[PDB]
Amino acid sequence: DPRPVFVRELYTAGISTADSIGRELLRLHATQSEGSAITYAIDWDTMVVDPSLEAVRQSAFVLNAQTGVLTLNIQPTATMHGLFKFEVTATDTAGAQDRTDVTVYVVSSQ
Ligand SMILES: [Mg+2]
């Protein structure tokens, strides 16, 4: 059954007002037994966010489709609270998929 296999079923990271645009939050990785190249994508239908994050629901992160590197794409502010939760797909050239869960906590700061 040649198909992508994510290394982990859950990836997590914390962001705060101390972070800057471009920070690498985590690196998603799936293996494929036949060496078929993997594309990584956020499933925007799975994106669930704290009400305070509604404005940055679509812009908070970028996922590089080839590297699996998730980057912070906004400057967190003192008015941003709670969690982002979403699913990421790994798709091989034949269209076979795996899924993994991602949680990003907005960490309390002074
Ligand atoms: Mg699976």
mmCIF file with all atom_site columns, all heavy atoms in Angstrom, residues 10-35:
data_model
loop_
_atom_site.group_PDB
_atom_site.id
_atom_site.type_symbol
_atom_site.label_atom_id
_atom_site.label_alt_id
_atom_site.label_comp_id
_atom_site.label_asym_id
_atom_site.label_entity_id
_atom_site.label_seq_id
_atom_site.pdbx_PDB_ins_code
_atom_site.Cartn_x
_atom_site.Cartn_y
_atom_site.Cartn_z
_atom_site.occupancy
_atom_site.B_iso_or_equiv
_atom_site.pdbx_formal_charge
_atom_site.auth_seq_id
_atom_site.auth_comp_id
_atom_site.auth_asym_id
_atom_site.auth_atom_id
_atom_site.pdbx_PDB_model_num
ATOM 1   N N   . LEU A 1 10 ? 0.534  14.216 15.545 1.00 0.00 ? 10 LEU A N   1
ATOM 2   C CA  . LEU A 1 10 ? 0.218  15.551 16.113 1.00 0.00 ? 10 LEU A CA  1
ATOM 3   C C   . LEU A 1 10 ? 1.520  16.339 16.175 1.00 0.00 ? 10 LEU A C   1
ATOM 4   O O   . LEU A 1 10 ? 2.539  15.776 16.592 1.00 0.00 ? 10 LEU A O   1
ATOM 5   C CB  . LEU A 1 10 ? -0.438 15.444 17.497 1.00 0.00 ? 10 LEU A CB  1
ATOM 6   C CG  . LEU A 1 10 ? -0.580 16.800 18.204 1.00 0.00 ? 10 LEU A CG  1
ATOM 7   C CD1 . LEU A 1 10 ? -1.627 17.729 17.547 1.00 0.00 ? 10 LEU A CD1 1
ATOM 8   C CD2 . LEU A 1 10 ? -0.883 16.688 19.719 1.00 0.00 ? 10 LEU A CD2 1
ATOM 9   N N   . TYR A 1 11 ? 1.499  17.584 15.686 1.00 0.00 ? 11 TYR A N   1
ATOM 10  C CA  . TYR A 1 11 ? 2.618  18.545 15.762 1.00 0.00 ? 11 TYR A CA  1
ATOM 11  C C   . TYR A 1 11 ? 2.066  19.730 16.535 1.00 0.00 ? 11 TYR A C   1
ATOM 12  O O   . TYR A 1 11 ? 0.890  20.082 16.354 1.00 0.00 ? 11 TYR A O   1
ATOM 13  C CB  . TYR A 1 11 ? 3.029  18.974 14.357 1.00 0.00 ? 11 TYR A CB  1
ATOM 14  C CG  . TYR A 1 11 ? 3.758  17.944 13.552 1.00 0.00 ? 11 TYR A CG  1
ATOM 15  C CD1 . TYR A 1 11 ? 3.056  17.016 12.801 1.00 0.00 ? 11 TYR A CD1 1
ATOM 16  C CD2 . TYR A 1 11 ? 5.139  17.943 13.449 1.00 0.00 ? 11 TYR A CD2 1
ATOM 17  C CE1 . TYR A 1 11 ? 3.715  16.075 12.017 1.00 0.00 ? 11 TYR A CE1 1
ATOM 18  C CE2 . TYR A 1 11 ? 5.825  16.995 12.692 1.00 0.00 ? 11 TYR A CE2 1
ATOM 19  C CZ  . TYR A 1 11 ? 5.103  16.061 11.954 1.00 0.00 ? 11 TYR A CZ  1
ATOM 20  O OH  . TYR A 1 11 ? 5.725  15.112 11.201 1.00 0.00 ? 11 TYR A OH  1
ATOM 21  N N   . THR A 1 12 ? 2.872  20.311 17.386 1.00 0.00 ? 12 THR A N   1
ATOM 22  C CA  . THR A 1 12 ? 2.431  21.464 18.232 1.00 0.00 ? 12 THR A CA  1
ATOM 23  C C   . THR A 1 12 ? 3.542  22.506 18.276 1.00 0.00 ? 12 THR A C   1
ATOM 24  O O   . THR A 1 12 ? 4.709  22.167 18.048 1.00 0.00 ? 12 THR A O   1
ATOM 25  C CB  . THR A 1 12 ? 2.034  21.033 19.658 1.00 0.00 ? 12 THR A CB  1
ATOM 26  O OG1 . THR A 1 12 ? 3.206  20.528 20.285 1.00 0.00 ? 12 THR A OG1 1
ATOM 27  C CG2 . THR A 1 12 ? 1.002  19.926 19.659 1.00 0.00 ? 12 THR A CG2 1
ATOM 28  N N   . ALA A 1 13 ? 3.173  23.752 18.531 1.00 0.00 ? 13 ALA A N   1
ATOM 29  C CA  . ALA A 1 13 ? 4.125  24.883 18.614 1.00 0.00 ? 13 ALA A CA  1
ATOM 30  C C   . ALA A 1 13 ? 3.396  25.984 19.382 1.00 0.00 ? 13 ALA A C   1
ATOM 31  O O   . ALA A 1 13 ? 2.164  25.920 19.511 1.00 0.00 ? 13 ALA A O   1
ATOM 32  C CB  . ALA A 1 13 ? 4.520  25.397 17.237 1.00 0.00 ? 13 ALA A CB  1
ATOM 33  N N   . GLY A 1 14 ? 4.164  26.863 20.007 1.00 0.00 ? 14 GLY A N   1
ATOM 34  C CA  . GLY A 1 14 ? 3.638  28.041 20.699 1.00 0.00 ? 14 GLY A CA  1
ATOM 35  C C   . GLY A 1 14 ? 4.148  29.290 20.045 1.00 0.00 ? 14 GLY A C   1
ATOM 36  O O   . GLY A 1 14 ? 5.312  29.278 19.618 1.00 0.00 ? 14 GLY A O   1
ATOM 37  N N   . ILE A 1 15 ? 3.304  30.305 19.936 1.00 0.00 ? 15 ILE A N   1
ATOM 38  C CA  . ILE A 1 15 ? 3.718  31.648 19.425 1.00 0.00 ? 15 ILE A CA  1
ATOM 39  C C   . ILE A 1 15 ? 3.356  32.663 20.501 1.00 0.00 ? 15 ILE A C   1
ATOM 40  O O   . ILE A 1 15 ? 2.443  32.410 21.276 1.00 0.00 ? 15 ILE A O   1
ATOM 41  C CB  . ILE A 1 15 ? 3.088  32.016 18.070 1.00 0.00 ? 15 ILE A CB  1
ATOM 42  C CG1 . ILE A 1 15 ? 1.566  32.106 18.157 1.00 0.00 ? 15 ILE A CG1 1
ATOM 43  C CG2 . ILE A 1 15 ? 3.556  31.021 16.983 1.00 0.00 ? 15 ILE A CG2 1
ATOM 44  C CD1 . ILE A 1 15 ? 0.894  32.535 16.863 1.00 0.00 ? 15 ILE A CD1 1
ATOM 45  N N   . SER A 1 16 ? 4.086  33.764 20.537 1.00 0.00 ? 16 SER A N   1
ATOM 46  C CA  . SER A 1 16 ? 3.779  34.881 21.469 1.00 0.00 ? 16 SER A CA  1
ATOM 47  C C   . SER A 1 16 ? 4.080  36.219 20.779 1.00 0.00 ? 16 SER A C   1
ATOM 48  O O   . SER A 1 16 ? 4.608  36.224 19.609 1.00 0.00 ? 16 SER A O   1
ATOM 49  C CB  . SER A 1 16 ? 4.538  34.717 22.753 1.00 0.00 ? 16 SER A CB  1
ATOM 50  O OG  . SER A 1 16 ? 5.893  35.067 22.574 1.00 0.00 ? 16 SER A OG  1
ATOM 51  N N   . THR A 1 17 ? 3.781  37.309 21.502 1.00 0.00 ? 17 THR A N   1
ATOM 52  C CA  . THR A 1 17 ? 4.116  38.680 21.074 1.00 0.00 ? 17 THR A CA  1
ATOM 53  C C   . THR A 1 17 ? 5.647  38.801 20.932 1.00 0.00 ? 17 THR A C   1
ATOM 54  O O   . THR A 1 17 ? 6.085  39.648 20.249 1.00 0.00 ? 17 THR A O   1
ATOM 55  C CB  . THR A 1 17 ? 3.502  39.677 22.070 1.00 0.00 ? 17 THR A CB  1
ATOM 56  O OG1 . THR A 1 17 ? 3.994  39.360 23.375 1.00 0.00 ? 17 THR A OG1 1
ATOM 57  C CG2 . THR A 1 17 ? 1.993  39.634 22.058 1.00 0.00 ? 17 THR A CG2 1
ATOM 58  N N   . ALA A 1 18 ? 6.465  37.951 21.541 1.00 0.00 ? 18 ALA A N   1
ATOM 59  C CA  . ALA A 1 18 ? 7.939  38.005 21.397 1.00 0.00 ? 18 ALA A CA  1
ATOM 60  C C   . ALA A 1 18 ? 8.360  37.553 19.993 1.00 0.00 ? 18 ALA A C   1
ATOM 61  O O   . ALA A 1 18 ? 9.538  37.744 19.671 1.00 0.00 ? 18 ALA A O   1
ATOM 62  C CB  . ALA A 1 18 ? 8.614  37.172 22.462 1.00 0.00 ? 18 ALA A CB  1
ATOM 63  N N   . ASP A 1 19 ? 7.489  36.928 19.195 1.00 0.00 ? 19 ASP A N   1
ATOM 64  C CA  . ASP A 1 19 ? 7.948  36.351 17.908 1.00 0.00 ? 19 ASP A CA  1
ATOM 65  C C   . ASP A 1 19 ? 7.822  37.407 16.820 1.00 0.00 ? 19 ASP A C   1
ATOM 66  O O   . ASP A 1 19 ? 7.010  38.340 16.950 1.00 0.00 ? 19 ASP A O   1
ATOM 67  C CB  . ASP A 1 19 ? 7.189  35.080 17.510 1.00 0.00 ? 19 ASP A CB  1
ATOM 68  C CG  . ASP A 1 19 ? 7.380  33.939 18.497 1.00 0.00 ? 19 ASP A CG  1
ATOM 69  O OD1 . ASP A 1 19 ? 8.523  33.755 18.960 1.00 0.00 ? 19 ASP A OD1 1
ATOM 70  O OD2 . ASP A 1 19 ? 6.359  33.277 18.827 1.00 0.00 ? 19 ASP A OD2 1
ATOM 71  N N   . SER A 1 20 ? 8.577  37.180 15.753 1.00 0.00 ? 20 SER A N   1
ATOM 72  C CA  . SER A 1 20 ? 8.615  38.013 14.518 1.00 0.00 ? 20 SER A CA  1
ATOM 73  C C   . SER A 1 20 ? 8.195  37.171 13.309 1.00 0.00 ? 20 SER A C   1
ATOM 74  O O   . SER A 1 20 ? 8.431  35.921 13.300 1.00 0.00 ? 20 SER A O   1
ATOM 75  C CB  . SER A 1 20 ? 9.985  38.579 14.347 1.00 0.00 ? 20 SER A CB  1
ATOM 76  O OG  . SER A 1 20 ? 9.868  39.965 14.136 1.00 0.00 ? 20 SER A OG  1
ATOM 77  N N   . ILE A 1 21 ? 7.588  37.816 12.319 1.00 0.00 ? 21 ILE A N   1
ATOM 78  C CA  . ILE A 1 21 ? 7.271  37.224 10.991 1.00 0.00 ? 21 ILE A CA  1
ATOM 79  C C   . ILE A 1 21 ? 8.464  36.367 10.546 1.00 0.00 ? 21 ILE A C   1
ATOM 80  O O   . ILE A 1 21 ? 9.628  36.805 10.722 1.00 0.00 ? 21 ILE A O   1
ATOM 81  C CB  . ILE A 1 21 ? 6.993  38.305 9.922  1.00 0.00 ? 21 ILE A CB  1
ATOM 82  C CG1 . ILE A 1 21 ? 6.048  39.431 10.366 1.00 0.00 ? 21 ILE A CG1 1
ATOM 83  C CG2 . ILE A 1 21 ? 6.575  37.609 8.630  1.00 0.00 ? 21 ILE A CG2 1
ATOM 84  C CD1 . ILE A 1 21 ? 4.574  39.168 10.178 1.00 0.00 ? 21 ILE A CD1 1
ATOM 85  N N   . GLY A 1 22 ? 8.207  35.167 10.027 1.00 0.00 ? 22 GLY A N   1
ATOM 86  C CA  . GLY A 1 22 ? 9.263  34.350 9.402  1.00 0.00 ? 22 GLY A CA  1
ATOM 87  C C   . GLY A 1 22 ? 9.751  33.255 10.331 1.00 0.00 ? 22 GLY A C   1
ATOM 88  O O   . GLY A 1 22 ? 10.389 32.299 9.827  1.00 0.00 ? 22 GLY A O   1
ATOM 89  N N   . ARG A 1 23 ? 9.485  33.364 11.642 1.00 0.00 ? 23 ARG A N   1
ATOM 90  C CA  . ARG A 1 23 ? 9.878  32.307 12.615 1.00 0.00 ? 23 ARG A CA  1
ATOM 91  C C   . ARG A 1 23 ? 9.423  30.930 12.068 1.00 0.00 ? 23 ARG A C   1
ATOM 92  O O   . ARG A 1 23 ? 8.254  30.804 11.712 1.00 0.00 ? 23 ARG A O   1
ATOM 93  C CB  . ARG A 1 23 ? 9.241  32.615 13.969 1.00 0.00 ? 23 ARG A CB  1
ATOM 94  C CG  . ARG A 1 23 ? 9.531  31.563 15.022 1.00 0.00 ? 23 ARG A CG  1
ATOM 95  C CD  . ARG A 1 23 ? 9.069  31.899 16.426 1.00 0.00 ? 23 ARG A CD  1
ATOM 96  N NE  . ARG A 1 23 ? 9.225  30.650 17.140 1.00 0.00 ? 23 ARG A NE  1
ATOM 97  C CZ  . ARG A 1 23 ? 8.306  30.061 17.923 1.00 0.00 ? 23 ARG A CZ  1
ATOM 98  N NH1 . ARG A 1 23 ? 7.180  30.656 18.249 1.00 0.00 ? 23 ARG A NH1 1
ATOM 99  N NH2 . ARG A 1 23 ? 8.534  28.819 18.327 1.00 0.00 ? 23 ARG A NH2 1
ATOM 100 N N   . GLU A 1 24 ? 10.333 29.967 11.975 1.00 0.00 ? 24 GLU A N   1
ATOM 101 C CA  . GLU A 1 24 ? 9.976  28.568 11.665 1.00 0.00 ? 24 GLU A CA  1
ATOM 102 C C   . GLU A 1 24 ? 9.338  27.969 12.920 1.00 0.00 ? 24 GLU A C   1
ATOM 103 O O   . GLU A 1 24 ? 10.030 27.866 13.875 1.00 0.00 ? 24 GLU A O   1
ATOM 104 C CB  . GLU A 1 24 ? 11.161 27.718 11.183 1.00 0.00 ? 24 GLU A CB  1
ATOM 105 C CG  . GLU A 1 24 ? 11.741 28.261 9.887  1.00 0.00 ? 24 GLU A CG  1
ATOM 106 C CD  . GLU A 1 24 ? 12.787 27.394 9.247  1.00 0.00 ? 24 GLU A CD  1
ATOM 107 O OE1 . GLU A 1 24 ? 13.235 26.409 9.919  1.00 0.00 ? 24 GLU A OE1 1
ATOM 108 O OE2 . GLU A 1 24 ? 13.170 27.710 8.105  1.00 0.00 ? 24 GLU A OE2 1
ATOM 109 N N   . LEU A 1 25 ? 8.077  27.554 12.862 1.00 0.00 ? 25 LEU A N   1
ATOM 110 C CA  . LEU A 1 25 ? 7.332  26.957 13.991 1.00 0.00 ? 25 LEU A CA  1
ATOM 111 C C   . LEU A 1 25 ? 7.542  25.453 14.038 1.00 0.00 ? 25 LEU A C   1
ATOM 112 O O   . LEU A 1 25 ? 7.765  24.939 15.110 1.00 0.00 ? 25 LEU A O   1
ATOM 113 C CB  . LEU A 1 25 ? 5.866  27.280 13.804 1.00 0.00 ? 25 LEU A CB  1
ATOM 114 C CG  . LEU A 1 25 ? 5.594  28.761 13.826 1.00 0.00 ? 25 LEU A CG  1
ATOM 115 C CD1 . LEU A 1 25 ? 4.119  28.997 13.782 1.00 0.00 ? 25 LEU A CD1 1
ATOM 116 C CD2 . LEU A 1 25 ? 6.200  29.426 15.038 1.00 0.00 ? 25 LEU A CD2 1
ATOM 117 N N   . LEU A 1 26 ? 7.433  24.762 12.914 1.00 0.00 ? 26 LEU A N   1
ATOM 118 C CA  . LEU A 1 26 ? 7.645  23.300 12.964 1.00 0.00 ? 26 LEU A CA  1
ATOM 119 C C   . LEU A 1 26 ? 7.894  22.792 11.558 1.00 0.00 ? 26 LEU A C   1
ATOM 120 O O   . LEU A 1 26 ? 7.742  23.583 10.604 1.00 0.00 ? 26 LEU A O   1
ATOM 121 C CB  . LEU A 1 26 ? 6.427  22.650 13.625 1.00 0.00 ? 26 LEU A CB  1
ATOM 122 C CG  . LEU A 1 26 ? 5.077  22.970 13.041 1.00 0.00 ? 26 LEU A CG  1
ATOM 123 C CD1 . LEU A 1 26 ? 4.804  22.039 11.873 1.00 0.00 ? 26 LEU A CD1 1
ATOM 124 C CD2 . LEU A 1 26 ? 3.975  22.838 14.071 1.00 0.00 ? 26 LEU A CD2 1
ATOM 125 N N   . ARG A 1 27 ? 8.347  21.556 11.436 1.00 0.00 ? 27 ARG A N   1
ATOM 126 C CA  . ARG A 1 27 ? 8.706  20.967 10.124 1.00 0.00 ? 27 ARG A CA  1
ATOM 127 C C   . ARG A 1 27 ? 7.964  19.645 10.011 1.00 0.00 ? 27 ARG A C   1
ATOM 128 O O   . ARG A 1 27 ? 8.307  18.728 10.730 1.00 0.00 ? 27 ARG A O   1
ATOM 129 C CB  . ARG A 1 27 ? 10.200 20.732 9.883  1.00 0.00 ? 27 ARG A CB  1
ATOM 130 C CG  . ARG A 1 27 ? 10.436 20.240 8.452  1.00 0.00 ? 27 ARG A CG  1
ATOM 131 C CD  . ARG A 1 27 ? 11.893 20.098 8.011  1.00 0.00 ? 27 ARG A CD  1
ATOM 132 N NE  . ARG A 1 27 ? 11.910 19.969 6.558  1.00 0.00 ? 27 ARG A NE  1
ATOM 133 C CZ  . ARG A 1 27 ? 12.740 19.271 5.821  1.00 0.00 ? 27 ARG A CZ  1
ATOM 134 N NH1 . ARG A 1 27 ? 13.678 18.517 6.361  1.00 0.00 ? 27 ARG A NH1 1
ATOM 135 N NH2 . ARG A 1 27 ? 12.584 19.306 4.524  1.00 0.00 ? 27 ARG A NH2 1
ATOM 136 N N   . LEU A 1 28 ? 6.949  19.615 9.164  1.00 0.00 ? 28 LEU A N   1
ATOM 137 C CA  . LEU A 1 28 ? 6.084  18.442 8.951  1.00 0.00 ? 28 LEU A CA  1
ATOM 138 C C   . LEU A 1 28 ? 6.884  17.526 8.021  1.00 0.00 ? 28 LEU A C   1
ATOM 139 O O   . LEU A 1 28 ? 7.613  18.056 7.197  1.00 0.00 ? 28 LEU A O   1
ATOM 140 C CB  . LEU A 1 28 ? 4.771  18.893 8.315  1.00 0.00 ? 28 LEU A CB  1
ATOM 141 C CG  . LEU A 1 28 ? 3.907  19.784 9.202  1.00 0.00 ? 28 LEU A CG  1
ATOM 142 C CD1 . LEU A 1 28 ? 2.891  20.617 8.475  1.00 0.00 ? 28 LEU A CD1 1
ATOM 143 C CD2 . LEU A 1 28 ? 3.114  18.950 10.165 1.00 0.00 ? 28 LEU A CD2 1
ATOM 144 N N   . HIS A 1 29 ? 6.789  16.219 8.182  1.00 0.00 ? 29 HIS A N   1
ATOM 145 C CA  . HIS A 1 29 ? 7.528  15.265 7.310  1.00 0.00 ? 29 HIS A CA  1
ATOM 146 C C   . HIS A 1 29 ? 6.706  13.990 7.157  1.00 0.00 ? 29 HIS A C   1
ATOM 147 O O   . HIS A 1 29 ? 6.220  13.442 8.179  1.00 0.00 ? 29 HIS A O   1
ATOM 148 C CB  . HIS A 1 29 ? 8.921  14.963 7.846  1.00 0.00 ? 29 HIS A CB  1
ATOM 149 C CG  . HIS A 1 29 ? 9.758  14.180 6.873  1.00 0.00 ? 29 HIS A CG  1
ATOM 150 N ND1 . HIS A 1 29 ? 10.235 14.747 5.699  1.00 0.00 ? 29 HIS A ND1 1
ATOM 151 C CD2 . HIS A 1 29 ? 10.151 12.884 6.871  1.00 0.00 ? 29 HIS A CD2 1
ATOM 152 C CE1 . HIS A 1 29 ? 10.931 13.845 5.031  1.00 0.00 ? 29 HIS A CE1 1
ATOM 153 N NE2 . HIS A 1 29 ? 10.909 12.693 5.743  1.00 0.00 ? 29 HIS A NE2 1
ATOM 154 N N   . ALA A 1 30 ? 6.523  13.545 5.918  1.00 0.00 ? 30 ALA A N   1
ATOM 155 C CA  . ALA A 1 30 ? 5.966  12.213 5.599  1.00 0.00 ? 30 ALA A CA  1
ATOM 156 C C   . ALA A 1 30 ? 6.952  11.469 4.711  1.00 0.00 ? 30 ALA A C   1
ATOM 157 O O   . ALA A 1 30 ? 7.663  12.121 3.931  1.00 0.00 ? 30 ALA A O   1
ATOM 158 C CB  . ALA A 1 30 ? 4.619  12.337 4.937  1.00 0.00 ? 30 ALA A CB  1
ATOM 159 N N   . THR A 1 31 ? 7.094  10.171 4.945  1.00 0.00 ? 31 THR A N   1
ATOM 160 C CA  . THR A 1 31 ? 7.873  9.247  4.081  1.00 0.00 ? 31 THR A CA  1
ATOM 161 C C   . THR A 1 31 ? 6.926  8.530  3.104  1.00 0.00 ? 31 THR A C   1
ATOM 162 O O   . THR A 1 31 ? 5.725  8.330  3.418  1.00 0.00 ? 31 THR A O   1
ATOM 163 C CB  . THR A 1 31 ? 8.617  8.207  4.918  1.00 0.00 ? 31 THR A CB  1
ATOM 164 O OG1 . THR A 1 31 ? 7.586  7.509  5.610  1.00 0.00 ? 31 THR A OG1 1
ATOM 165 C CG2 . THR A 1 31 ? 9.620  8.788  5.880  1.00 0.00 ? 31 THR A CG2 1
ATOM 166 N N   . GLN A 1 32 ? 7.504  8.034  2.017  1.00 0.00 ? 32 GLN A N   1
ATOM 167 C CA  . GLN A 1 32 ? 6.807  7.324  0.928  1.00 0.00 ? 32 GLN A CA  1
ATOM 168 C C   . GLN A 1 32 ? 7.740  6.205  0.482  1.00 0.00 ? 32 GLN A C   1
ATOM 169 O O   . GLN A 1 32 ? 8.831  6.547  0.039  1.00 0.00 ? 32 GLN A O   1
ATOM 170 C CB  . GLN A 1 32 ? 6.477  8.338  -0.168 1.00 0.00 ? 32 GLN A CB  1
ATOM 171 C CG  . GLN A 1 32 ? 5.147  8.066  -0.859 1.00 0.00 ? 32 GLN A CG  1
ATOM 172 C CD  . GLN A 1 32 ? 5.303  6.997  -1.915 1.00 0.00 ? 32 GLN A CD  1
ATOM 173 O OE1 . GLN A 1 32 ? 6.412  6.512  -2.185 1.00 0.00 ? 32 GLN A OE1 1
ATOM 174 N NE2 . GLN A 1 32 ? 4.165  6.620  -2.499 1.00 0.00 ? 32 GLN A NE2 1
ATOM 175 N N   . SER A 1 33 ? 7.328  4.948  0.666  1.00 0.00 ? 33 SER A N   1
ATOM 176 C CA  . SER A 1 33 ? 8.125  3.705  0.421  1.00 0.00 ? 33 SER A CA  1
ATOM 177 C C   . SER A 1 33 ? 8.667  3.613  -1.017 1.00 0.00 ? 33 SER A C   1
ATOM 178 O O   . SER A 1 33 ? 9.631  2.858  -1.230 1.00 0.00 ? 33 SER A O   1
ATOM 179 C CB  . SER A 1 33 ? 7.302  2.457  0.736  1.00 0.00 ? 33 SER A CB  1
ATOM 180 O OG  . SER A 1 33 ? 6.129  2.406  -0.084 1.00 0.00 ? 33 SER A OG  1
ATOM 181 N N   . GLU A 1 34 ? 8.098  4.335  -1.983 1.00 0.00 ? 34 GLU A N   1
ATOM 182 C CA  . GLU A 1 34 ? 8.560  4.229  -3.392 1.00 0.00 ? 34 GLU A CA  1
ATOM 183 C C   . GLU A 1 34 ? 9.321  5.504  -3.785 1.00 0.00 ? 34 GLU A C   1
ATOM 184 O O   . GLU A 1 34 ? 9.628  5.646  -4.981 1.00 0.00 ? 34 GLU A O   1
ATOM 185 C CB  . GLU A 1 34 ? 7.370  3.970  -4.326 1.00 0.00 ? 34 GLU A CB  1
ATOM 186 C CG  . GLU A 1 34 ? 6.852  2.538  -4.241 1.00 0.00 ? 34 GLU A CG  1
ATOM 187 C CD  . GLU A 1 34 ? 5.688  2.271  -5.199 1.00 0.00 ? 34 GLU A CD  1
ATOM 188 O OE1 . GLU A 1 34 ? 4.728  3.064  -5.161 1.00 0.00 ? 34 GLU A OE1 1
ATOM 189 O OE2 . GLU A 1 34 ? 5.713  1.285  -5.970 1.00 0.00 ? 34 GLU A OE2 1
ATOM 190 N N   . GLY A 1 35 ? 9.572  6.420  -2.839 1.00 0.00 ? 35 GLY A N   1
ATOM 191 C CA  . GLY A 1 35 ? 10.324 7.660  -3.115 1.00 0.00 ? 35 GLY A CA  1
ATOM 192 C C   . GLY A 1 35 ? 9.517  8.682  -3.898 1.00 0.00 ? 35 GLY A C   1
ATOM 193 O O   . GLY A 1 35 ? 10.102 9.600  -4.464 1.00 0.00 ? 35 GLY A O   1
#
